[PDB]
Amino acid sequence: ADFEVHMLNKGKDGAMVFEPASLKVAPGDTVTFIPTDKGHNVETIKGMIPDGAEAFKSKINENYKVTFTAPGVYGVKCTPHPFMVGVVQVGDAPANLEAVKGAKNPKKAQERLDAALAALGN
């Protein structure tokens, strides 16, 4: 299955958001990150992807597709926008949950990640 995440200046969560900011997918599913507004990108957060996964980074304004196969959670962020974060989950019982949940980001970033994990049933 293929899924889309839009990069937006504003959403229910406030300014600078991935929408949806949380997505549960099956191994082999894909997510394309699509800038609805200019000035955004996507990249994985250091330490926040599974063993077996590769990091990634898009260019500002680039439409960017990633295939997810390694099971676990994947924290992603937008470079210019500190609170702009999201979580892609592959499978159930992710094994690297604490990598995201136990991290020490600025509060508004960390609460958005934490909300994303809780919405994914964790």
Tokens of 57: 């980074």
Piece of 33-41, 42-50, 63-71, 91-99 that binds Cl ion (CB under 5 A): 63-71
| Interacting residues with Cu ion between 72 and 101 (CB under 5 A) | 78, 81, 84
Minimum distance between the CB of residue 43 and Cu ion, rounded to whole angstroms?
A: 11
CA distance 1 to 117: 21
Q: Does 67 sit near Cl ion (CB under 5 A)?
A: no
Site string for Cl ion, 11-50 (x = CB under 5 A): ----------------------------------------
Q: Is 6 annotated as a binding residue?
A: no
CA distance 116 to 105: 14
Q: Which is nearer to Cu ion, 66 or 84 (CB)?
A: 84
Of the candidates 15, 3, 22, which has an alpha carbon nearest to the alpha carbon of residue 119?
A: 22
Tokens of 83: 């609170």
Q: Which residues are annotated as a binding site for Cu cation?
A: 40, 78, 81, 84
Residues that bind Cu ion (CB under 5 A): 16, 40, 78, 81, 84
Residues that bind Cl ion (CB under 5 A): 62-63
